Design a protein around this ligand. Structure first.
Ligand SMILES: NCCc1cnn(-c2nccc3c(=O)[nH]cnc23)c1
Ligand SMILES: [Mn+2]
Ligand SMILES: [Mn+2]
Ligand SMILES: [Zn+2]
Length: 456
């Protein structure tokens, strides 16, 4: 038996409220952060025209075995065209229920999905055109191409809700990042079929996510607020400890399907929604989400970071350190890049960056004092941003170093962060060197530039 979780919040903004996606996300935040997920219905007349081909888009989907609490990789079979996939997906659903596809109630597909995943005896497998990059097969939204676009497509070219534009807006903080982070700046496409699913997870660096269902049958979502994150993790650890083991890579991350009633029984707040064609779903920082597709569909998604997120981004990197998890980027490097462009930053952005930079500088001061008292006397400036990520990870916690690291003449090429000085080599401290990006003296004027920009 399945007891559907309560409905998540649904917003229907006016053209005025809709005008700015970031001001709207800030306005809904007090409500939506209590549920983790929320649904946004654009004004009735906001209708972008679709941009991908049925016979020219090709993809190899991931095969999915429908088994609850069975470990799966976050990212990992034949070739399909969007047309051939749809024929397969439609024949599957209609044969499964012995009904015309539009006639299958959503409540029934939902109950069936949850029965199916818990029944050991049924070995149902589906396919999911998941994490297809927008860079290669193109966005479902209009984009500037050196092809001719109809004035209808030109209306939506510069919309903040066109998911190609959201990352590069000034209210976005990932915009300013020069470093290669294609997984967090570029949209991903999801070609679903009945029962194709996404396991319980959170976004990298606890970022927000925005998902648009371009067309097709609904996408069913389950969401948990950010405040209940550790509570969900404690529940999932007791029932499936197998996927909670330490991982030596980001590409090897273990996720699973878990019934939301199991979470609800353990007093974890869970909300649901059926996202229909033309609707958006926004996931908030550290908000756990999972779901499945009701049928053949096409969605597009991108991650994003607001000014509200900056302190959480710092807390996340601190959490990755404790867990020995690899970072996608250095948060401190991002803060310093924004500090270096203080003059061109939005005044609200500059103000928030300044507040995080003050924390970073104060933590750096303490860490430098501690490593001096450990006997590390020699020091040399280092341009950490020039090193490939694999060349600047803490041997112990795997953090991407930016502000500083410790090196040893005994272990060439190896680096530790200032938290793990004792993990580097087995040589005396006088043989170590403090490698730093900036002196404390260079850092205070970088912060003053931000203060001048925010005070203007
Ligand atoms: N490389 C990105 C990995 C990633 C991060 N979130 N996520 C998802 N979140 C939300 C929704 C979906 C979905 O509808 N289908 C597949 N995946 C989804 C996937
Ligand atoms: Mn099963
Ligand atoms: Mn997600
Ligand atoms: Zn470390």
């Amino acid at each position: 038996m399945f007891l559907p979780p309560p409905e998540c919040p649904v917003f229907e903004p006016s053209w005025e409220e809709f005008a700015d996606p970031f001001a709207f996300i800030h306005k809904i935040r007090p409500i939506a952060e209590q549920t983790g997920i929320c649904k946004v219905r654009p004004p009735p007349d906001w209708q972008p025209p679709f941009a991908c081909d049925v016979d020219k888009l090709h993809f190899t989907p991931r095969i999915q075995r429908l088994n609850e609490l069975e470990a799966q990789t976050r990212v990992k079979a034949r070739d399909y065209t969007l047309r051939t996939f749809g024929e397969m997906a439609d024949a599957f659903k209609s044969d499964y229920f012995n009904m015309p596809v539009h006639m299958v109630p959503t409540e029934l597909v939902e109950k069936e999905f949850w029965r199916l995943v818990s029944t050991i005896e049924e070995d149902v497998t589906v396919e999911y055109g998941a994490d297809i990059a927008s860079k290669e097969f193109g966005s479902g939204f209009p984009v500037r191409d050196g092809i001719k676009l109809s004035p209808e497509e030109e209306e939506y070219l510069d919309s903040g809700w066109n998911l190609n534009n959201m990352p590069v807006m000034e209210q976005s903080v990932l915009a300013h990042i020069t470093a290669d982070i294609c997984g967090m700046k570029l949209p991903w496409l999801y070609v679903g079929m009945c029962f194709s699913s996404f396991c319980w997870h959170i976004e990298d660096h606890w970022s927000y996510s925005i998902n648009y269902l371009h067309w097709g049958e609904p996408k069913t979502w389950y969401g948990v607020p950010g405040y209940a994150a550790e509570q969900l993790e404690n529940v999932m650890k007791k029932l499936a400890p197998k996927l909670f083991v330490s991982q030596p890579d980001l590409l090897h991350q273990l996720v699973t399907i878990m019934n939301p009633n199991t979470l609800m029984t353990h007093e974890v707040p869970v909300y649901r929604t059926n996202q229909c064609a033309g609707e958006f779903v926004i996931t908030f920082p550290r908000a756990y989400h999972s779901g499945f597709n009701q049928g053949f569909n096409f969605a597009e998604a991108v991650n994003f970071c607001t000014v509200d997120w900056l302190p959480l981004g710092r807390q996340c990197v601190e959490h990755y350190r404790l867990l020995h998890r690899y970072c996608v980027f250095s948060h401190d490097e991002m803060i310093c890049k924004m500090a270096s462009k203080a003059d061109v930053l939005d005044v609200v952005v500059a103000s928030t960056v300044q507040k995080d930079m003050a924390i970073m500088i104060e933590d750096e001061k303490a860490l430098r004092e501690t490593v001096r008292k450990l006997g590390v006397i020699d020091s040399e400036r280092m341009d950490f941003e020039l090193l490939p990520d694999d060349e600047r990870q803490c041997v112990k916690c795997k953090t991407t170093c930016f502000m500083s690291a410790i090196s040893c003449s005994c272990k060439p090429g190896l680096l530790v962060c200032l938290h793990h000085v004792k993990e580097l080599c087995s040589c005396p401290p006088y043989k170590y060197k403090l490698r730093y990006r900036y002196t404390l003296d260079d850092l205070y004027p970088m912060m003053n530039a931000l203060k001048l920009r925010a005070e203007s």
